[PDB]
Protein backbone atom coordinates (compact mmCIF):
# COMPACT_ATOMS: atom_id res chain seq x y z
CA UNK A 1 0.00 0.00 0.00
CA UNK A 2 1.15 3.50 -0.86
CA UNK A 3 1.44 5.47 -4.06
CA UNK A 4 3.86 8.34 -3.57
CA UNK A 5 3.36 12.03 -4.26
CA UNK A 6 5.53 13.06 -7.21
CA UNK A 7 8.40 15.41 -6.40
CA UNK A 8 8.24 17.43 -9.61
CA UNK A 9 6.75 20.94 -9.46
CA UNK A 10 3.76 21.45 -11.78
CA UNK A 11 5.53 24.53 -13.17
CA UNK A 12 9.28 24.48 -12.27
CA UNK A 13 9.99 27.88 -13.89
CA UNK A 14 7.58 29.55 -11.48
CA UNK A 15 9.76 28.08 -8.71
CA UNK A 16 11.28 31.51 -8.15
CA UNK A 17 9.28 33.84 -5.90
CA UNK A 18 10.84 36.69 -7.89
CA UNK A 19 9.36 35.30 -11.11
CA UNK A 20 6.01 34.59 -9.43
CA UNK A 21 5.96 38.25 -8.37
CA UNK A 22 6.53 39.37 -11.98
CA UNK A 23 3.32 37.52 -12.98
CA UNK A 24 1.34 39.91 -10.78
CA UNK A 25 2.29 42.93 -12.93
CA UNK A 26 -1.41 43.12 -13.84
CA UNK A 27 -2.96 41.87 -10.57
CA UNK A 28 -6.29 43.77 -10.58
CA UNK A 29 -7.07 47.05 -8.78
CA UNK A 30 -10.32 45.60 -7.37
CA UNK A 31 -8.33 42.57 -6.11
CA UNK A 32 -7.94 42.78 -2.35
CA UNK A 33 -4.87 40.63 -1.50
CA UNK A 34 -1.24 41.81 -1.99
CA UNK A 35 0.77 39.99 -4.70
CA UNK A 36 3.85 39.71 -2.44
CA UNK A 37 1.92 37.53 0.00
CA UNK A 38 0.50 35.45 -2.85
CA UNK A 39 3.92 34.90 -4.44
CA UNK A 40 5.54 34.13 -1.12
CA UNK A 41 2.89 31.41 -0.71
CA UNK A 42 3.90 29.81 -4.04
CA UNK A 43 1.11 31.30 -6.14
CA UNK A 44 1.51 33.04 -9.47
CA UNK A 45 -1.09 34.95 -11.47
CA UNK A 46 -2.82 33.40 -14.50
CA UNK A 47 -5.36 35.01 -16.80
CA UNK A 48 -6.45 38.61 -16.36
CA UNK A 49 -8.85 38.41 -13.38
CA UNK A 50 -7.73 37.19 -9.95
CA UNK A 51 -6.95 33.52 -10.65
CA UNK A 52 -3.73 32.10 -9.22
CA UNK A 53 -2.18 28.63 -9.19
CA UNK A 54 0.56 27.22 -7.02
CA UNK A 55 3.76 26.56 -8.98
CA UNK A 56 4.24 23.25 -7.22
CA UNK A 57 0.85 21.61 -6.64
CA UNK A 58 -0.98 23.69 -9.30
CA UNK A 59 -3.79 24.37 -6.85
CA UNK A 60 -5.97 27.04 -8.43
CA UNK A 61 -7.67 29.76 -6.40
CA UNK A 62 -9.59 32.94 -7.21
CA UNK A 63 -12.22 35.31 -5.71
CA UNK A 64 -9.63 36.70 -3.30
CA UNK A 65 -10.86 39.02 -0.54
CA UNK A 66 -9.32 41.39 2.02
CA UNK A 67 -7.98 39.39 4.96
CA UNK A 68 -7.65 36.08 3.04
CA UNK A 69 -4.35 34.52 4.02
CA UNK A 70 -2.67 32.86 0.99
CA UNK A 71 -0.63 30.44 3.12
CA UNK A 72 -3.86 29.48 4.92
CA UNK A 73 -5.91 29.19 1.72
CA UNK A 74 -3.04 27.04 0.43
CA UNK A 75 -3.30 24.73 3.49
CA UNK A 76 -7.09 24.70 3.35
CA UNK A 77 -7.28 23.54 -0.25
CA UNK A 78 -4.02 21.77 -1.13
CA UNK A 79 -2.82 20.18 2.12
CA UNK A 80 -0.42 17.75 0.46
CA UNK A 81 1.46 20.39 -1.58
CA UNK A 82 5.14 19.65 -0.94
CA UNK A 83 5.97 23.35 -1.28
CA UNK A 84 3.44 24.37 1.36
CA UNK A 85 4.74 21.63 3.65
CA UNK A 86 8.44 22.47 3.32
CA UNK A 87 7.65 26.15 3.90
CA UNK A 88 5.02 26.07 6.66
CA UNK A 89 5.56 22.60 8.16
CA UNK A 90 3.35 19.65 9.11
CA UNK A 91 1.92 21.35 12.24
CA UNK A 92 0.66 24.41 10.33
CA UNK A 93 -1.19 22.45 7.62
CA UNK A 94 -2.72 20.03 10.15
CA UNK A 95 -4.00 23.01 12.15
CA UNK A 96 -5.74 24.55 9.12
CA UNK A 97 -7.23 21.14 8.18
CA UNK A 98 -8.44 20.34 11.72
CA UNK A 99 -10.40 23.63 11.67
ZN1 LIG B 1 0.94 24.16 -3.67
Curated annotation (Swiss-Prot):
BIR repeats: from-to residues: 20-85
Recorded superkingdom: Eukaryota
Modifications the protein undergoes after translation, according to the UniProt entry: Autoubiquitinated and undergoes proteasome-mediated degradation.
Effect after changing residue 54 to A: Abolishes inhibition of caspases and anti-apoptotic activity
Positions contributing to Zn(2+) binding: 54, 57, 74, 81
Subcellular location: Nucleus; Cytoplasm; Golgi apparatus
Distribution of this protein across tissues and organs: Isoform 1 and isoform 2 are expressed at very low levels or not detectable in most adult tissues. Detected in adult heart, placenta, lung, lymph node, spleen and ovary, and in several carcinoma cell lines. Isoform 2 is detected in fetal kidney, heart and spleen, and at lower levels in adult brain, skeletal muscle and peripheral blood leukocytes.
Subunit structure: Binds to CASP9. Interaction with DIABLO/SMAC via the BIR domain disrupts binding to CASP9 and apoptotic suppressor activity. Interacts with TAB1. In vitro, interacts with CASP3 and CASP7 via its BIR domain.
Function: Apoptotic regulator capable of exerting proapoptotic and anti-apoptotic activities and plays crucial roles in apoptosis, cell proliferation, and cell cycle control. Its anti-apoptotic activity is mediated through the inhibition of CASP3, CASP7 and CASP9, as well as by its E3 ubiquitin-protein ligase activity. As it is a weak caspase inhibitor, its anti-apoptotic activity is thought to be due to its ability to ubiquitinate DIABLO/SMAC targeting it for degradation thereby promoting cell survival.
Domain remark text: The RING domain is essential for autoubiquitination.
Family label: Belongs to the IAP family.
Protein name: Baculoviral IAP repeat-containing protein 7
Originating species: Homo sapiens
Encoding gene, per UniProt annotation: BIRC7
Positions spanned in the full protein: 71 to 169 of 298
Amino acid sequence: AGATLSRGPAFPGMGSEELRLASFYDWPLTAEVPPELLAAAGFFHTGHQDKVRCFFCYGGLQSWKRGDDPWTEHAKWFPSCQFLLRSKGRDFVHSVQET
